[PDB]
Structure formats: structure tokens, C-alpha cells
Design a protein around this ligand. Sequence first.
Ligand SMILES: [Mg+2]
Ligand SMILES: [Mg+2]
Ligand SMILES: [Mg+2]
Ligand SMILES: [Mg+2]
Ligand SMILES: [Mg+2]
Ligand SMILES: [Mg+2]
Ligand SMILES: [Mg+2]
Ligand SMILES: [Mg+2]
Ligand SMILES: [Mg+2]
Ligand SMILES: [Mg+2]
Ligand SMILES: [Mg+2]
Ligand SMILES: [Mg+2]
Ligand SMILES: [Mg+2]
Ligand SMILES: [Mg+2]
Ligand SMILES: [Mg+2]
Ligand SMILES: [Mg+2]
Ligand SMILES: [Mg+2]
Ligand SMILES: [Mg+2]
Ligand SMILES: [Mg+2]
Ligand SMILES: [Mg+2]
Ligand SMILES: [Mg+2]
Ligand SMILES: [Mg+2]
Ligand SMILES: [Mg+2]
Ligand SMILES: [Mg+2]
Ligand SMILES: [Mg+2]
Ligand SMILES: [Mg+2]
Ligand SMILES: [Mg+2]
Ligand SMILES: [Mg+2]
Ligand SMILES: [Mg+2]
Ligand SMILES: [Mg+2]
Ligand SMILES: [Mg+2]
Ligand SMILES: [Mg+2]
Ligand SMILES: [Mg+2]
Ligand SMILES: [Mg+2]
Lengths: 176, 146, 179, 129
Amino acid sequence: SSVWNLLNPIRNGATGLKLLSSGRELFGTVIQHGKMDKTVTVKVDYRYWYPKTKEFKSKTSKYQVHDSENFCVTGDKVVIKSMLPISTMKHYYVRNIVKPFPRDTYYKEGQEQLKKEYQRLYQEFYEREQQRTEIKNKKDEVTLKSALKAKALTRAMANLRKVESTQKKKDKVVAA
Amino acid sequence: MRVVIRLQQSGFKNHPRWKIVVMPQKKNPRGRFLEHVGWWCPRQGKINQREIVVNKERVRYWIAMGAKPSEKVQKFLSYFDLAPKPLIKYGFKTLYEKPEVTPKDYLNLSPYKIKNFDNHLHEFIQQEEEVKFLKQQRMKNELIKQ
Amino acid sequence: LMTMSKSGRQFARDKPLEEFIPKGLEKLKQKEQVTINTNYKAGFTSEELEPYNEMVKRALKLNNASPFEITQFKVQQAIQKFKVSPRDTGSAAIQVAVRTEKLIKMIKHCQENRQDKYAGRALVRLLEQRRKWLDYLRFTDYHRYKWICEEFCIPDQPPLNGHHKANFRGEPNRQVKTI
Amino acid sequence: CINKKKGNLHRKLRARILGINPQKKGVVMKARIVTPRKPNSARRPVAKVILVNKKRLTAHIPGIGHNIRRHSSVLVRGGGCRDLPGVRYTCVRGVYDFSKVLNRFNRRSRYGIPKPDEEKKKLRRKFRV
RNA sequence: UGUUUACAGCUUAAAGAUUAUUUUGUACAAUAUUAGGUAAUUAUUUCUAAAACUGUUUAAUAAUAUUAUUUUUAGUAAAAUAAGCCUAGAUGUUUAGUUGAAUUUAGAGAUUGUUCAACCACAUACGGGUAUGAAAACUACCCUAUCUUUUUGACAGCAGUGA
RNA sequence: AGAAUUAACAAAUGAGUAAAUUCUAGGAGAAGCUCUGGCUAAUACAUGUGCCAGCAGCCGCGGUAAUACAUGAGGAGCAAGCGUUACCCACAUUGACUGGGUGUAUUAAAUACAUAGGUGAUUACAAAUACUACUUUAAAAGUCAAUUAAAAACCUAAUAUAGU
RNA sequence: AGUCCGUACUGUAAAAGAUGAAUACUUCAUGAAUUAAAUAUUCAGGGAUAGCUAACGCAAAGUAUUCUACUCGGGGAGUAUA
RNA sequence: AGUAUCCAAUCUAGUAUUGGUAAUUUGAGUGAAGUUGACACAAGGUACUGGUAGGGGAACCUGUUGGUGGAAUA
Ligand SMILES: [Mg+2]
Ligand SMILES: [Mg+2]
Ligand SMILES: [Mg+2]
Ligand SMILES: [Mg+2]
Ligand SMILES: [Mg+2]
Ligand SMILES: [Mg+2]
Ligand SMILES: [Mg+2]
Ligand SMILES: [Mg+2]
Ligand SMILES: [Mg+2]
Ligand SMILES: [Mg+2]
Ligand SMILES: [Mg+2]
Ligand SMILES: [Mg+2]
Ligand SMILES: [Mg+2]
Ligand SMILES: [Mg+2]
Ligand SMILES: [Mg+2]
Ligand SMILES: [Mg+2]
Ligand SMILES: [Mg+2]
Ligand SMILES: [Mg+2]
Ligand SMILES: [Mg+2]
Ligand SMILES: [Mg+2]
Ligand SMILES: [Mg+2]
Ligand SMILES: [Mg+2]
Ligand SMILES: [Mg+2]
Ligand SMILES: [Mg+2]
Ligand SMILES: [Mg+2]
Ligand SMILES: [Mg+2]
Ligand SMILES: [Mg+2]
Ligand SMILES: [Mg+2]
Ligand SMILES: [Mg+2]
Ligand SMILES: [Mg+2]
Ligand SMILES: [Mg+2]
Ligand SMILES: [Mg+2]
Ligand SMILES: [Mg+2]
Ligand SMILES: [Mg+2]
């Protein structure tokens, strides 16, 4: 064994770090990363007193945290601390990783004419939709587009598949 | 708001018992305060007595930090060498002389006095103060021994 | 069993998780036929058999074997790859591989014999038990988790709990009750 | 429980129509007689009531003789008579339209009898002790 | 163009006390004879608007040639991208002012939340809105609406009257 | 019961009032209410009534022999209250942390896998915590075992939280 | 008719051991079974008892620990209504 | 000043949901010395009963599976 680990929170347990009370600072675990920009979901456990049963209780809770470098992943165990809300549902940020979790970088490194198809299909529906149904609801503004493009692209791919057909039917008729 | 020192009541009907509090001027005088400082109990009992209590260590905070008493408290704090006395209505340097002060009521204090032997009480006091002198003159012969 | 359910509760509309990547089953089935056509039984090698005659080889050949024997080769074929120490048999990397070879059989057994209700309950256990060792192995040797899921055509979906309760859960924070 | 909306809801109340209140006033529609159960045998008087809350009701008449008729204002006690069914309430005497029981000089508090002028010998100290 | 260390009163700036507003965590009733709810919704970036402007040097930042960069609030009556957020009793319905604490009790607890006190709310109406001020609507003021007597008024201010 | 005087809340000004003092008369000059079968302390007394009239908090009385009704006497208890009703708490382990039960006493739902959550093996080591003593915060009022055997009062403990 | 088979619904009962799931330890007799010089124990109710229990009764319904659920008298009533 | 936008009360209609009231109808408990018959507790005179299906002056009868909260047969 060694001697210099004796304050590392891993060998030490989580006891060594001294956290402020009242939800100022906390200990927890990340659940999501990369699904949104500069945000990570986190889980924490509480322990308070309940006198009628004369035993502590527990409570899980979820928070959303501000990560500036998009640096953390799920298993990374991390301290978080209170900040004023820069946005809704974000009043916490990260202070420090206590225990890391390995990354997926070594595996990530290994991992055009349609742009004239795409830009038409957009302009198709904005001319139709705006006349038929106005802005009224954002749900309609989004549920259409995401559901209309696949209806459009398999029709716009079909517009370009004709190009391979027309050019060759000339050469077949011009050659022979 | 500004900070004020003034009274506040806790005593009941026909039995006043005031307090001293550091509170601002805008809140309910019967409400909250920032620091209980002192008392003002005028009545007597076998246990409680007629008092003016204060905590100098905190009156010297708020006055040093921004505060101002009322008229009564300015009087009560005069005797603690923190403030001056408030001025009389018509004014000092004009008071006329009055007859001498006399005690009306002895307040119902019962120090050690013997009952049903009123005639001979003067004898009791000689015998008690003679013994003062004896132990004095007789405590000397120990001090030589030590 | 485990479903996409970000809250504490588990609904009806929530969908089960994905066992395989798209077209994961068929790729594995193709690998077997390649083995079945060119391999012998588990214990035996081609080098040991070259003096002996063909009639001895065709018997030992794995075409003629039973599916209970077809796995035994595939298992030991995996153990030589995904072991930690020699004569390893029970470590997590192998235990997941065993269930993947069973799922190939249970589905074939259940697609065909649909009324074997006892089997329909047995899938739900294999998946769940696979879903545990598949998680416990992420946590310990993450760079072996990925070297498995590629071979067996498995998706890389982390757990929604975030490995919270097994790893380094401690000192759970203080609050107070009132009223 | 639904009529009860305080305290232990699990407790079945001891006077449901009368409810949380200690007493309640009403008006008679009609008087009646009801027999007791089989072990006993008698004709115990009964007095219907409509309450101010518009609720039908039955009630007991403890006194021997009674002034009761139709259109009589009455006040309920809530206690009841035991042998009778549906008579778990009881009226109060010495009030709006009852009468003190008569030729009676014992238990003068239940029945509303004031104190006679013979037994009392001295006045209250607020006037001429 | 008397004196602002003669007294009172007023203006302006700074330092500090206190106060008002803004922020979070946990606690906080029953019910599934209510389970999907949210749609500028969830996150980032951008744009616009207000915050005194310009330069010099230094620091620091990413590349590194040394140039460029450095902040906060609000708005979807600003837009784009990606698709998420709550559901670990969201939402919805019902009931109810919360608390210190009062009654009881050996103690834990149970039931209630009257007097006084703190905070929040209302002031004929679950109503709409403004001026002043460090802070407001409570006997402020304007409008609508209900009821009532004088074009006022709404006693949940004290006393008092009716029901 | 009656009459009188004073202190103090203003050593200029009191609306109103001493749980203070003295004096005279005279010598308790303030009593009711419930109950009388058992639970429940108190009568096998008297009369009439006869499953009628009526009592009744619960059990239950009354059918000619009524300590249970009504009359009368005697007697018991509480006491400026006594008694009745309505709601709440305790007594109750009658809602179970302290502190129950679940084979037969109208209580384990038909059953298993399983999520959230709860829970949990050995040694060695660190770290922190509990326990002890001290200390921080938790408005006053109210409660609280205030102490030198003391009323008109100002227990500093408990519990919870941070910390040595 | 149905009773039987196939496809699918229906989803209740005295659904029973009327006894929630798991672990450790625990009596005497009678008896069932491996078969052991690789490896030593498992099981039963048709008996009784310690101990527990209101009693009848149970080798767990016993001693000890961990989690979940139900239970606030009876009738109305496993019914009305939605 | 004023045009144009945003917005409240009141009013209209239907829809959704929850309550109040009613011709008429129906159920339950309770009381009493009633009539008809004899289902049930004993093997209740044909062992009772659960789930279900059909039948039916009433209490009830029969099939099909289960249980003992039934006796009896050596
Ligand atoms: Mg207590
Ligand atoms: Mg209140
Ligand atoms: Mg009041
Ligand atoms: Mg008041
Ligand atoms: Mg009014
Ligand atoms: Mg005000
Ligand atoms: Mg008034
Ligand atoms: Mg004076
Ligand atoms: Mg005298
Ligand atoms: Mg006796
Ligand atoms: Mg007689
Ligand atoms: Mg209790
Ligand atoms: Mg069971
Ligand atoms: Mg179960
Ligand atoms: Mg788990
Ligand atoms: Mg306090
Ligand atoms: Mg059985
Ligand atoms: Mg069975
Ligand atoms: Mg059962
Ligand atoms: Mg026991
Ligand atoms: Mg038992
Ligand atoms: Mg036995
Ligand atoms: Mg056994
Ligand atoms: Mg048991
Ligand atoms: Mg019931
Ligand atoms: Mg029943
Ligand atoms: Mg049924
Ligand atoms: Mg039903
Ligand atoms: Mg209906
Ligand atoms: Mg009708
Ligand atoms: Mg019969
Ligand atoms: Mg029969
Ligand atoms: Mg019949
Ligand atoms: Mg029988």
C-alpha cells in the first residue's frame, strides 16, 4: 500500500470534502451528456430526520447543471454548487469531479447534390403552410416540418433518380 | 428605514412591565425586534425588584453604527455613561427650591428583624456589635502564630 | 423489465429497450453457418485429426452435431478472446456472451412454439440478467464492454440510473424536516 | 364519513342530524306513540320535528304530562331514549313552548322546574343579601 | 449682489446601518371513482433595445506573425438550430389560510390552527388600470359591474342596530 | 361587612387602579346541586301503582312481595358550582417508531419475474460520524423541573443543524 | 347445447398450506434414499415433546435479523353510482 | 389630440363536467305474537357450499370444476 492517498476522496471515502448545507453544495451523479449544449442532468440523494419513526429518510432528486466545456459524462461523480439562474431549471453548476468515468474518444475518432433538393422542399411548404395555417402554435410549426421532410425527401430523391434515367436514354438513342 | 431604541410592553393589566428593544421605526412596536437590550420593571416583590437593566455591549454597537433613542431611554441611558440626560420641560437653571425629601413607604422589605420583643431590641444590638470588636482584637493572636 | 422511463415510475406506453442493433440477428446467424461448415467439435482441433480418416472427421464435424454442442464451440471460441486470466469461465465478459448465444435459440424456439408459455417468461429473465451483467461490465472494464458489443451486435445504451447505486454512493447529503 | 368534516372522520357520530352542534331548535308537525321492543312493553310518547335546516325528525318526551300540539317550537338535547328505535334524540324542557312538569319538586333541573319560594330564604348579594 | 460655526429649513455626492424587491434546497392534506401533461415549450447561439464615449499601455486568452477577443439585465409585439423538459403521485379534482403554538399526554403522538404575535392575502366584485414615492391602496384617484341613496355611498376600524 | 390613608406607573402634569396599611362594629353574617339496584360511596325502611303510568350513561327495572317508577322520611357525595348535551385527548398495544396482530376470531390481494426505493458478507487501512464535555443558529409571548425551603419572576434544558 | 382440438377474447373461485419472500441456528423416536478409499449428507409426515399459542394445534405458527402489504366494530355490502 | 393594435366586465349560443329538483318507479334496514310452505344447522332427512351456466310460486332445483366450514363404511 501507499501513504499519499490518505486524503484522496476515493480511498478516503466521500467524508473528507466539507460541503456547505441547505443545498448550497451537493454530491451526485451525472445521467446525461451531449444531448444538449452546456447542460448535464444529475442525480442526488438526501437524508433528513423524521421523528415519528425515529429514523432518517431518503429522497432522490434530479437537477440540471451548467457545464461550460461540455466535459462530463454520466458516471463521473461530481460536486455541484448553487448559482443564480441564468436560465430556467439551471441554478447549479459543476465545481469538481470526485471520481472519473472513462470516455469514448479513442472510438469516436474513427467515426451533396441533395442541397438543391433540400432547399426546394423547404420553400414548398412555407408557401403552402403560411397561406393555409398561420403561426398560431409552435407545436404545429415543428410537428409538420419534422414529419413533412421525410414525406418530401423520398419524393425529392425521386426527382434526382430521374436524372440518372434521362441522361442515359439519350445516349442509348444517340449511340445506336 | 432608520433604527430606533424605545420601549415595548410585556406586562399585563394594571401591572406594567416594559422592555428595551432595537427596532426600526416602521414596524409594529409590539412586533419584532433585532436585539433585546434591557428591561424596565417598576414594581416590587419578595423576589423581583425595581430595576433598570441594559446591555452596554450592544447599545454601543447601534449608537456606534447608527441609532437614536427616545426620550425615556435617553434618561435611562444617562446613568450608564452612554448618553446625556433629557431636558426638563420648562428647563434647567430655573428650578425653585422645594422642601426636603422624605421616605413615604418602606416598600415591604423584611430584613432580619426580630418580632414580639420590641422593648429589648436595643439590647440585642449591643451584644451583636460587641462581638465585632472581640473577634477583631482576638484575631490578632492567630496572625502572630502564623 | 427495463424501459425508456426517465422518471421513477414505469408506464405502459414506455417502450422496452433494444436488444440488438438493426440487422444484428442475421449477421450472427451468418457467422454460425461459416463456423458450422468449417470447424470440428469443441475439444478437437484439425491438427489432431489429420492422421485419422474422413469417416472419423465427419462424425466429429460440427454439421452433424446438436445445437447444444454447436454453442460449446462458440462459447470456448469466445473465452479465448474475452478472458482476464487463464482458465477463466465466470467473469462478466463471458457471462454476457453466453446469454447472446441463448437468445439466438430461445427466439427460434419461441417464434415456432408460441404456446410454450414457460419460455416466454424465460426470455424476460435472460434479457434482464443480460441487462445487469451488461451494466456491471461497463462500470468495471469499459474498454472491454465496447470490444464485446461490436462482436455480438449490441447497442451502447448507458443505464438511466447512471450507475448511481453501485458506484461510490456515500455521505448522502443533509437536509432538515420542519412543520 | 360525510356529514362529519372535523376531527376523527373514522368515528361515527352520536347525533347525525343534529350534527356538530350541541342543540338545535325546530317545530312540531305531529305527536305520536311508539311501542318499545319485545322485552319491555309500554306506550312512550314521541314528537316529530322539522328543523330549521329542513330535516325530518323524531324526539322523546320525558315528562309525564306535556303541552305538546302542532305548531310548537322545541329544542333538542341529542341524548335519546334507549328501548325505542329511531328516538336517539330527546327534547329539552323549560324552553320556548314546553312546560315545567307539574306537582313535582324533585330533580328540578332536568324538567325545568325553578326553585319554589318556600325553600329559598335569602336573596343574592347584588341586592338585599 | 450682508453673514449658511447664529437657529430652523432645503439641495448634491460618498461611507456605512436598516428597509423593499429579485434567487435556491428541504419540509408542506386527501384522491388514480384523473394519468399523460408542456408548445417561446427545454437548452445553446444570435439579433434588437437600455446601461457615457474614445484612446494608451499592461495582464490574460486561442493560434502565434502577433493581431483579434474580453460585461450585465430584458423582450418571441425577434429569429434560427437541436429536440428536450416535468411525470421519483407532472397535470386535474376536492378541502383548507401557513407557523410560533393551544387542548390532552409519563413520554412519543394525535385533533384543532380561536385570543396575542410574525409572514402572506383581501378591503362591495377571485375584476381592469394609473400618478407620486425609498416603500402603496389599506377611507387615494379613473373605468366596468352589483347593491343601495342621492349623484354621495359599500362599518371584515371602535361602539351600536337588524337578520 | 363598613370607613379611612398612602406609595408607585410623571421627584413639573394622572384617566384609572395597590394581590400594600391602619381603624370600628360584631363574632360565619356565602350556599346550592346531584344520588340513593350493580359499575358507584349511600335503605333489603314505609305507601300506592301493577309489563300500565314512568326511569334509563351501560347492564337492565315494573306481571301484587317494586332498596330501581311516583309520594315521604332517613342517608351519601361534589361544592360556587352540581348535572345534561356536542366535539377532541388520555385511560387503549382503540391504530402500533416507543408498541400490536394476520393458520381457525368476516385480516397476506391467485401467482412469479422486475423498475423506482429500501436493505445487506470477511480482514486490513484511511476518513468521517455516533457517545461524552463545551460552543452556533432556531423572534418575543406561551410552556418549561426557576431555588439559599423564597409566587405575581428574566429555569437554557430537551429536540434539530453547523462546528471544536 | 356443451363436453375434445385449433385462433382469439373473457381474467373470476373455499385461487387453500385459508399460513407473504429470503437467510442463520434448534428435539427424540420411527422411517424414505444415495452409497463414499475424490467428495458426506439430503428428505418425510402417519408419532411426541421443548418453546410459542385464547384453546384446537405447529418442528414451524419456534429463537434472531431485512424489506413490502392489509387491518379504525357489525348490519347496509363486494351491493348502488361513475 | 388622434388613427391602428392588445385587454376586462356584461350579454348570446352550444358543448364538456359537476351539483340541486320531479310525475312515476324501485331497493334496503327496522318493528310486531300475521299467512303460505319447510330452504338451513344432525348424514336436517337428496352432505352443505364457493366460481359459473341454465331453469324457477318463494325459501330454492340440476349440470360442470373446487373446497371441507359433513357424517358414515374396517
Ligand atoms: Mg409532548
Ligand atoms: Mg389565524
Ligand atoms: Mg375573534
Ligand atoms: Mg385584537
Ligand atoms: Mg361588508
Ligand atoms: Mg397597512
Ligand atoms: Mg363593529
Ligand atoms: Mg407620582
Ligand atoms: Mg372588632
Ligand atoms: Mg354499594
Ligand atoms: Mg309495595
Ligand atoms: Mg394510541
Ligand atoms: Mg397468498
Ligand atoms: Mg405476490
Ligand atoms: Mg435495485
Ligand atoms: Mg423563544
Ligand atoms: Mg385444506
Ligand atoms: Mg387448488
Ligand atoms: Mg387468502
Ligand atoms: Mg410470539
Ligand atoms: Mg394467533
Ligand atoms: Mg407435529
Ligand atoms: Mg418436516
Ligand atoms: Mg403466521
Ligand atoms: Mg361496515
Ligand atoms: Mg359481508
Ligand atoms: Mg361476484
Ligand atoms: Mg360491481
Ligand atoms: Mg345517473
Ligand atoms: Mg318521485
Ligand atoms: Mg329442511
Ligand atoms: Mg338438505
Ligand atoms: Mg320455488
Ligand atoms: Mg356441518
